[PDB]
Amino acid sequence: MEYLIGIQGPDYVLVASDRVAASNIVQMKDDHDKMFKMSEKILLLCVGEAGDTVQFAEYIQKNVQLYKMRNGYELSPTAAANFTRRNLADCLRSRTPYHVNLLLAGYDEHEGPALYYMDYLAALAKAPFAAHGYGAFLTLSILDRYYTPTISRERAVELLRKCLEELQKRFILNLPTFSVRIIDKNGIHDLDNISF
Amino acid sequence: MSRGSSAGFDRHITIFSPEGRLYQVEYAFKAINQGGLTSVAVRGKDCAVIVTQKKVPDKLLDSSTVTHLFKITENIGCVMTGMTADSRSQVQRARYEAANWKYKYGYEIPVDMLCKRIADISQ
Amino acid sequence: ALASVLEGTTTLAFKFRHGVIVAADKVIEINPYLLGTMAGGAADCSFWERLLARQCRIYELRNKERISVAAASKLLANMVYQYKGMGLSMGTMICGWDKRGPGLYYVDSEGNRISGATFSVGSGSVYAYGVMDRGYSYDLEVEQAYDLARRAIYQATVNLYHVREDGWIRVS
Amino acid sequence: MFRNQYDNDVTVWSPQGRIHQIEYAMEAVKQGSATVGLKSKTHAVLVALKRAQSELAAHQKKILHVDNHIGISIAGLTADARLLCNFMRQECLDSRFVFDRPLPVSRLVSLIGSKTQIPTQRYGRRPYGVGLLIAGYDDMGPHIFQTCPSANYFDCRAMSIGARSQSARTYLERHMSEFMECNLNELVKHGLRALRETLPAEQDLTTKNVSIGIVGKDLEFTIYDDDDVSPFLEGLEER
Amino acid sequence: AVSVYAPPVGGFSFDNCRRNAVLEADFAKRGYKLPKVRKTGTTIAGVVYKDGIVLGADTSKIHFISPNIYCCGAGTAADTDMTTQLISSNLELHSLSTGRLPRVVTANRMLKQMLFRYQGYIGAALVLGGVDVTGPHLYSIYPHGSTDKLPYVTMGSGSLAAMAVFEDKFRPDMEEEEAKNLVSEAIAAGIFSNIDLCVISKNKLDFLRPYTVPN
Amino acid sequence: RRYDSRTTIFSPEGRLYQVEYAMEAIGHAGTCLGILANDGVLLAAERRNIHKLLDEVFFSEKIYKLNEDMACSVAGITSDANVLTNELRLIAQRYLLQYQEPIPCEQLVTALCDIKQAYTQFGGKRPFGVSLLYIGWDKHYGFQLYQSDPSGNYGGWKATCIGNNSAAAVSMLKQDYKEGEMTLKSALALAIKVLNKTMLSAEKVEIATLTRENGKTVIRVLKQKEVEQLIKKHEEEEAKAE
Amino acid sequence: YNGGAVMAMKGKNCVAIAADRFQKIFPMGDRLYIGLAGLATDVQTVAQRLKFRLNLYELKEGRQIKPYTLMSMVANLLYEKRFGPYYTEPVIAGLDPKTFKPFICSLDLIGCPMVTDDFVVSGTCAEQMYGMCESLWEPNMDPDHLFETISQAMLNAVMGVIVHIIEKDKITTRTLKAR
Amino acid sequence: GYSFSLTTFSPSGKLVQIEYALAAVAGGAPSVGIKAANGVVLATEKKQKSILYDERSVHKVEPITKHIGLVYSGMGPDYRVLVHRARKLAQQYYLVYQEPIPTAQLVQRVASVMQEYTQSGGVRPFGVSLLICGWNEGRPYLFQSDPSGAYFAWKATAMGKNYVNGKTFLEKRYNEDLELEDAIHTAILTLKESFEGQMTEDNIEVGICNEAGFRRLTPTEVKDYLAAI
Amino acid sequence: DLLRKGFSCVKNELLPSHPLELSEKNFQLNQDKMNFSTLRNIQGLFAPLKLQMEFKAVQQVQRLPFLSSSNLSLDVLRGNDETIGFEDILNDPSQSEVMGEPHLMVEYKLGLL
Amino acid sequence: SYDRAITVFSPDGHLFQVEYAQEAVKKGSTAVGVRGRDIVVLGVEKKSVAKLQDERTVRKICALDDNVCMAFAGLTADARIVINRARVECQSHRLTVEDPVTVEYITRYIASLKQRYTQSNGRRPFGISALIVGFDFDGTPRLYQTDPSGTYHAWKANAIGRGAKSVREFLEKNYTDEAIETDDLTIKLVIKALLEVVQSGGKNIELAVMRRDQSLKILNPEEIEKYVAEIEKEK
Amino acid sequence: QNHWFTYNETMTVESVTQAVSNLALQFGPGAMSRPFGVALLFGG
C-alpha cells in the first residue's frame, strides 16, 4: 500500500508521497525517499514493484542529463513527459510482468506549471490533479468536490490534510510519515513533513 | 580481393575510355574466334536447324566425346561457340535456370525468357 | 582454398562512528577490506561473491585505488538483476570503510538495494531488531557495542566481526 | 632481371611456370639449427641441437610435446611452429575425446598437409615457414615423417633438416643399413654421431646444447635436458 | 537514438503479442469486450461449361486477378483483399515482362506457396478460375495450402444444398445459359436477396496479340 | 602528387588534399545569398538553367522546405543535394516523433554535418561536394542563419554568400551591412544591389522570405511582379544617385 | 474501461464527426479529421505514427492529401501489425481539397475499409445505435439540421458530447450535454 | 592521373569518369521527344536494320504503366535492369497508395537509384540516359535523366549522336500551341535531319501518349505518317 | 553499455513470442540453404561455390549503413527483380523511425565493438 | 618513401602517418591550461575576428559533465565526434558505478577511442589534441593531455597549438607557489601567458574557469578587459 | 585474475608470459595488421 497525491495551482505544483518501503524480508527503518530529481525544475515520483522502478527512474534521469549536456539548455516538462511515455511503452513490451505508475511535475518559464498523469499502460494525460494507490477513488472524489484554479499554498495543504483526514476516518491505521514538496519559479522548495 | 585494379583505359572492366568505350568487352568478343569454328542456324516455315563444324585432329581421341550440341531441356537445343570450359559452364547455368523457372511458375520456360535470363546474368 | 575465401540462520549488523560490526549465529570474507554475509543458496552466494571479488581486484589493479562500498554494492545489484526470475535466491549485506565514513548496504536477488544504518535478517530476527533499536545509538563504546550484539543474539536464540579503517578482525 | 613483377605474390604464375614465393619460403628452413631423426624396429628417437644467443640466457625449446605417443622437432619460424603445435594438440585431443582411440600418425600428417596447402593459393596470406620432423608409435609400428613449407610430406626413415645438414644426411645415408637391428643405447649413439658432423672440427657435443626425445612401444614420449642426457653421452668416441 | 546499432528491416512486426496475451486474459477474466475482426462467410460456387467458366456469389465480391482470371473469397475480408491484390500485381509484372496473358496454373502455384508460407494464420479460402491458351480451369484453395482441380466447386456457409444441386443437375459440355441457370439455382438453394455472376468466355479473348495493360 | 589519391592520407605537413578539392569544386555553381534582418530572414539564388526549351515544373529549383519552420538552399552537385535534403527531412520528422516538439536549427545542422563528415574518414567513398545555407526560426534564439561545408564544418553568420564570386559579395556585404538595424525592406534592397554587382532580369533570380505572423511561421516565394518592381526601383534609385 | 463511441454523417456540402465526453478526434490537414476508439495508448501511438507519415508525404509530394489516400495509408499502417494488432477502430470524415465533396468511411483493427454514403458508426456500441440512426437520417440536410440530428442521435444512443461541423468556408466546434 | 578512379576529385574539382560516361551516352542512336498541347511524342532510330531480324523480339520503346512510357540512348544492356526496377517501383507505389504513381515521383526514384553507383569504388556508372513521358491530372510531362543522377524537365529535346543540330532545329521550329499530329510530323523531320540513309517504317519506332494512355505506334501507322512527308 | 542498450530480459529472449517470428526472421537463409543443398546434390560442389562467390562480390559495394541502399545487382542475381513480397510494402525501411549514430553503426558493421 | 601507409614501419622504426597527424595538430590555435590550488583555468586565443559572425556557434571550450571540461586544438570537425562520445560515456559510467567519473578515467577512454583509429588502412586518425581538467570526488584538481597517437600524461601546466614552445618556456620560468595562491593570481598568470604570443589582448582571448562544486563559468569581455587593465597598471 | 577465479592458485611467470605471447604472434576483426612495437620484461 503506497499513496501518491498531486495538486497544481496557478503558479505552483504541490506533490505529496509516502515514506515507507515495500521490503518484507529484512527489517529496516521505513525512511526511504521516493521522489526523483531530473533537473532544476522537474520532479518525477513513481510507484510500483521494487527493483525496476529505480532502474527506470535512473535511466530517465541520465537521459535528461545527457540531453542537457549536449545542447546547453534544459528540456521542457512536456518534452520530458513525452520522452518518458515513449520509453515506458517501449520497455513494457519486453518484460511482460511490469507495473510502474508515474506522475510528473515541473515548471517552465515559457508555459508555466504542469502536472502529467500516466497509468501502467503508458497513456499520458494532463490533469489538474491525480492520485495513485488504494483510496484513489475516494481521494479523487474529495478533490473534485473541493477544488478551484485559485487556491494558494495554504489552501492546497489544508485540502490535502482534509483528504488525509477523510482517509483516516474511513480507516485510520498505518498512515506513514509522508512528505510534501513544492515546485515554483525558484526551484524545488522542500516543505514541512506532515506525519499527522 | 585486395588485388586492386590495373591502371589504363583498357586492362580493367570498370573503366570508361575517353569516349566511353569498354575495351575488355571487345576483347571478350575477340576471344570467340579462338576456337576456330563456325556455327549456322536457320529457321524454316515449321522447323529450325542448327549446323556446326567438327574438328578432331588427333587419332588418339574418342570422337564420341567431342561435341558442341547440347540439350538444355527436352524441347530446347543449344550450340556453343568459343572456349570449351566456359561453354560447358554456361550450359550448366542455363539448365539450372530452366529448372528454377519450372519450379517457380509451373510450366516449361520459353526460349526468349531463357535467353533474357542468361543475358541478365551476364550483364 | 576458394571455400576459405568466403568464410534457520539469524544475522544482524549495524554501523556507527567507529566502523561497522556484523554478528551471526555464515559470513564470507570477500576482501581484506570488504566483508559479506550469506543467506539463501550456498552455491549462488559463493559464485557471485567470488565474481564480485575478482572484479573488485581488477578495478583496484586498473585504477591503483581501492573500490568504494557504494560502487561494489551497485555492481553486485546490476550483475544479479540480469538473471531476474530465474530462481536465484540470495540476501547479502556489504560492509566496509572506504571514505567519508563507514557504509552499510543490502542487496537481494529481486533487485532491492537499500542503504541503512541497522540490518537484521533470518527467522526470528524481529526480536533482535527490536532489542538493537531499543539499545541503538551513534556514540558508544566498542565493548558496549559488543555487549549489545551479544545480548541481541541471546534474545534471538557465535560469530562476531568488527570493521575498522584498516581492515576487519574476528573477536570470537 | 625479369623477376620483379612475378615474385611479390603467391597467386601469380611466372612466364616459366613457377611460383617464387613458395621457393622463398622454403629458403627459410635453413635459418635454424640442425635436427636429426631416425627409427628402428621398436623405437623412434629425435635429436636436436640447442643454441643460445649468449652466455647469460637459457636455450630455447626445440622439441615439443603433442600427445602421449607423438612428438615433434622444429626448424624455422617460431610463430608458425606454435600454431601448428596448437592445431595438432587440438586434433589429437578431439579424436581421443570422441572415439576413445589415438589419432593415427598418417591421418595427422594428411590433416597437416591439407591445412598447410590452403594459404598457398589464395590472396592475403603467405606460406608457412617451418619444417617439422614427427615421430610416433601406433599399431603399425614406429613412424617418422618430414614436413615442407610447400605442403609436402615424406614418409622417410632417417632424415635431418636445418642449416648445414648435408653432412648429417650423408652419414645417415651411409649408416642406414644397420639401424633396424639395434636397441636404444646405440640408436641414440648413432643419432648423436650423425648430429656431430654439423659442427666445425673444433667444437664438441657438450651436455648443454643437446635435446633428446624418445618414444617406443611401452615407453611414452620423454624429453631429456641438461643432466638427464648424461647417461646417453659417455659412450661416444672421439672425433 | 543511442540504442540502435543495426539498420531496421521491413515486414510484419511481432511486438504486442506478449502484452496482448496477458491483456486479453485479464479482460476476459474481468468480462470486458475488445474489438474483433470482420468475417464474410457466405456461399460461393463455380462450374465449367463447354468453353468457359461461371462464378457466382450472393449479396461485387468476385475479385479481379487478370483479364482472363477471376477469384472469389470466403473468410476474413482483409486477408482475402490483400492476397488478391498482391497476386494481381505479381501477375501484372509477369505479363509485362513476358508479353503474353498469364496461365491459371501460375496463379494457383503462387497462391498455394504464399498460403503455405504462413501456416494457416492467413485465413482465406479461394475459388480460382479462368481461361488460358490451354483451356478452362478452376481450383479450390484452402488456408493451409491445399489445392484441388475439380469440374464443379462450391464453398461457403450454405454449401450442402449447392453441392446437392451440382450432383443432381450436372453434365459435361454445358451450354452457357443453362450453366448460368444451374449456378443460379444452386446458389439460391442455399438461402431460404439477389446474386451476382461472372462469365469468362473463350470467344471474348484473343491469345494472338501482344499484351496491353488493362484499365 | 604522392599524397593526393585518397581521403585517408595525411600530407607531410598535415593537409587533406581530397577534402580541399571537394571544397574547391563548389566555386563552379551558382551564387546563393543570405542575410539576417531584424524581423525576418532572406534567401536569394541564381538560376543557371534558363533556356527557351525548359519547362517550369515545381516551385523552385534551388530552394527547399525542410519542416514547418526551416528552409534551405544548395550549391554544388544536384545528385548529392537531393540525398542530403531527403535525409534532412527524415531527421526532422524523427525528432518530431520522438519529442512532440519541432527540432532546433542548430541540432538539425549538427545532425547533417556528422553525416557529411563521416565520408571524409572511411576509405573507399567519395566526399559530398555540396554546400548548403539554412534559415529558420527557433523559440530559444529566434531567427537564425547557418552555412555548411563539404568537410563537415558549420557556423552561424549574419550575412554570408556561397558559390560563384563569393569574395566580392562577402566584401560588399561587410562594407554595407549595419548591425542590428536591418529591416526586411533594407535587406531586400541590399540583396538586389549585391546580386546586380556580382552578376539584371527578373527571370534569373529567386527570393524567399521567412517571417512570424500571429504565432505561426510563414515561408513565401516572391512573385515575378514583385521582383521586377524591386529591380526597377533599384535602377531608378541608382540613376537618381548619379 | 469504456471504449467510447465515434460517429459520422454527411449532408449538403458538409460532414459531421462526433464523439463522447482522453482526446479522440485528431485533425489531419485543413478539412480532414480522424477519430479513434479503443485503448488510449494504441490511439496515441497510431495518431503519432500517422502524423509522421502524413507530414513526410505532404513534404515530399508538395500537395495536400485526398481522403481516400489517407484511408489507404491508415489501412496499410494497421495491417502492418496483423498478428499482434492495435486495438483501435478509426473513422475518417472530410472534404476533398479541390472538388469539395463529402467522404466518410470506417475500418477495423486489421484494416478492412467500408465506404458508406449515408452514415458511419463504430465503437463498443455498434449493434445498437444502428436502427435509430437509420430512422433518423434524411438526404441532403443543411448544416444546422445536420448538427441537430447528429447531436440527437449521440445523446439518445448513450454524458456530454463534442461535435465538429466542417464546411467549405468555416469550421464549427461545439460541446453540449443533455438537459 | 585522376582519370582512372571513380572516387577521386581532380585539382580543379572535377569528376572525369562521369564525363566519360556522358561521352558514351553521346555516341548512341538519336532520340527525340516533343510535348504538345494534348500529348507527348517519342521517337528513335533502330540498330538492327537488316532483314534477318524478327520484328516482335526486342523493342527500344517500353511501357512502364498505363500512362508512362520510356526510351533511351546509350548502352543496351544497362537499360533492361532499369526498366524492370522502374516497373517494380510503380507497382509498389500502387500497392501502398491505391493510386497510379505520378511521373515526377518515378523520375525521382529512378534518379536516386542511378546516383548510388557514382560514389563507391568497385563499380562503374550507368552508360544510358532516359526520356520519360506521362499524363497526370490532364497535363503532359516530359523528363530526362543523366548518368550522374540529375534530371531536368523539358518541352522539346533531342539526345544521342548529333544532338546539338537537332536541338537547334527544334528551337527553330517549336510552337507553344501545337497538336499531336504536328508534333509527330516535327519529330519525324528532326529524326530525318540526321539519319545517314534512306528512312523507312521498318527501322524507326514511335510512341505516343495522351488521355487514353501510353501506346506504341504500329508499323502501318508509321508508314502512313511517312508517306505524308 | 547499460545506456546504449536496455530494457532486455534474458528469460524473455529464449522463448519466442509467436510461432512465425523465427521463420520470418530467417526465411532467406533457409531458402539459400535448401537451394544450395539441392544444387550440390544434383550437379556438384562448384555451383554453390560460384553462387556464394558472386553474392559476396556483389554485396560488397553499398552505401554506409546509416543510409538506405537499393541492392540492384543482388536482386538481379537472386531473381527477386520481378516479384513483390510482404517485405517490400509493409514497414518501409527507407522511412525508419529510429536510427543510430553514423560512426557507431559503421564500427559495429566492421565488428570492432 | 615509407609514409603512404598507416601500418607500415620505416627501416629505422618510424610510423609516419601518426607524425603527420601530429603535424596537423601543430597548426591549430594556442590553448593553455593551469591547475591551481582550488581552481582550474583554461584559455584559447581567437582567430580572425570575422565581424559578421555569431561568436556563440564557434567555441573551443566544452563541458563533458558537472565536474569535467575540455579544450582542444586541431581539426574542428573531428573534435565534435570525440566530445559527444565522451559525453555519452560519462553517463554510461554513472549508470554503471553510481559515482561521478574520474578525470583519469575519461582521459583513458578518450585515448583508447583515438587509438582505435590507428590500426587499419581503411580509416584515418583523428587530428586533434585535448586538454582535460576537472575535480575528483575527493576534491583534488587534475590536468591531462592526449595525442593523436593515443598516449596521455599528467601535467601541472602546459600549452598546445601553434606557438606553444614560447608559452611553455614562459610557464616554466614563471610558474611557482607564489603565483598560484589565489584565483586572481592564477587568472592573471593564464592571461599573461596567453598575451606572450597573441596580439593586442582583450579582444582575441576566450577564457573559462571552474571552481570546486561550482560548474563551468565563461568569463565575459567586461571581466577580461578589467583583468587586462589591472595587468597593464602593474608595471 | 581469471586463473585465480577458476583454480584458486597463482599463475606461473612462464604461464603468464606464454598467455601474453599467444596474443602478439597473430597478425595479418580486432586483430592488428602490424606487429607490436614493444618489448616486455617479466619477473617475480
From Swiss-Prot, chain B:
One of its GO terms (cellular component) is extracellular exosome. Keywords: Acetylation, Cytoplasm, Glycoprotein, Nucleus, Phosphoprotein, Proteasome. It is found in: Cytoplasm; Nucleus. Transmembrane segments: none annotated. GO terms for biological process: positive regulation of canonical NF-kappaB signal transduction; proteasome-mediated ubiquitin-dependent protein catabolic process; proteolysis involved in protein catabolic process; regulation of inflammatory response. Its main location: cytoplasm. Belongs to the peptidase T1A family. This is Proteasome subunit alpha type-6. It comes from Homo sapiens. The lineage of its organism: Eukaryota, Metazoa, Chordata, Craniata, Vertebrata. The gene is PSMA6. The chain holds residues 1 to 123 of 246 of the full protein.
UniProtKB/Swiss-Prot annotation, chain F:
It is found in: Cytoplasm; Nucleus. PANTHER family: PROTEASOME SUBUNIT ALPHA/BETA (PTHR11599). The modification Phosphoserine is found at residues 11, 73, 171. It holds the Pfam family Proteasome. The keyword Acetylation applies. The gene is PSMA4. GO terms for biological process: proteasome-mediated ubiquitin-dependent protein catabolic process. The keyword Lipid biosynthesis does not apply. SMART domains: Proteasome_A_N. This is Proteasome subunit alpha type-4. GO terms for cellular component: cytoplasm; cytosol; extracellular exosome; intracellular membrane-bounded organelle; nucleoplasm; nucleus; P-body; proteasome complex. Belongs to the peptidase T1A family. Component of the 20S core proteasome complex involved in the proteolytic degradation of most intracellular proteins. This complex plays numerous essential roles within the cell by associating with different regulatory particles. Associated with two 19S regulatory particles, forms the 26S proteasome and thus participates in the ATP-dependent degradation of ubiquitinated proteins. Keywords: Acetylation, Cytoplasm, Host-virus interaction, Nucleus, Phosphoprotein, Proteasome. Induction: Down-regulated by antioxidants BO-653 and probucol. InterPro entries: Ntn_hydrolases_N, Proteasome_alpha, Proteasome_alpha-type, Proteasome_asu_N, Proteasome_bsu_CS, Proteasome_sua/b. The modification N6-acetyllysine is found at residues 125, 174. NCBIfam families: PRK03996.1. It comes from the Eukaryota. Its main location: cytoplasm.
Swiss-Prot record, chain G:
GO terms for biological process: proteasome-mediated ubiquitin-dependent protein catabolic process. It comes from the Eukaryota. The 26S proteasome consists of a 20S proteasome core and two 19S regulatory subunits. The 20S proteasome core is a barrel-shaped complex made of 28 subunits that are arranged in four stacked rings. The two outer rings are each formed by seven alpha subunits, and the two inner rings are formed by seven beta subunits. The proteolytic activity is exerted by three beta-subunits PSMB5, PSMB6 and PSMB7. The keyword Acetylation applies. It is found in: Cytoplasm; Nucleus. Gene3D superfamilies: Glutamine Phosphoribosylpyrophosphate, subunit 1, domain 1. The modification N6-acetyllysine is found at residue 60. InterPro entries: Ntn_hydrolases_N (IPR029055), Proteasome_beta_3 (IPR033811), Proteasome_bsu_CS (IPR016050), Proteasome_sua/b (IPR001353), Proteasome_suB-type (IPR023333). SUPFAM superfamilies: N-terminal nucleophile aminohydrolases (Ntn hydrolases). PANTHER family: METALLOPROTEASE TLDD (PTHR32194), PROTEASOME SUBUNIT BETA TYPE-3 (PTHR32194:SF10). It comes from Homo sapiens. GO terms for cellular component: cytoplasm; cytosol; extracellular exosome; nucleoplasm; nucleus; proteasome complex; proteasome core complex; proteasome core complex, beta-subunit complex. Induction: Up-regulated in asthenozoospermic sperm. Belongs to the peptidase T1B family. Pfam families: Proteasome. This is Proteasome subunit beta type-3. Keywords: Acetylation, Cytoplasm, Host-virus interaction, Nucleus, Proteasome.
From Swiss-Prot, chain H:
Belongs to the peptidase T1A family. Pfam families: Proteasome, Proteasome_A_N. Phosphorylated on tyrosine residues; which may be important for nuclear import. Changing residue 106 to V: In a colorectal cancer sample; somatic mutation. This is Proteasome subunit alpha type-2. Its main location: cytoplasm. Component of the 20S core proteasome complex involved in the proteolytic degradation of most intracellular proteins. This complex plays numerous essential roles within the cell by associating with different regulatory particles. Associated with two 19S regulatory particles, forms the 26S proteasome and thus participates in the ATP-dependent degradation of ubiquitinated proteins. It comes from Homo sapiens (Human). SUPFAM superfamilies: N-terminal nucleophile aminohydrolases (Ntn hydrolases) (SSF56235). One of its GO terms (biological process) is proteasome-mediated ubiquitin-dependent protein catabolic process.
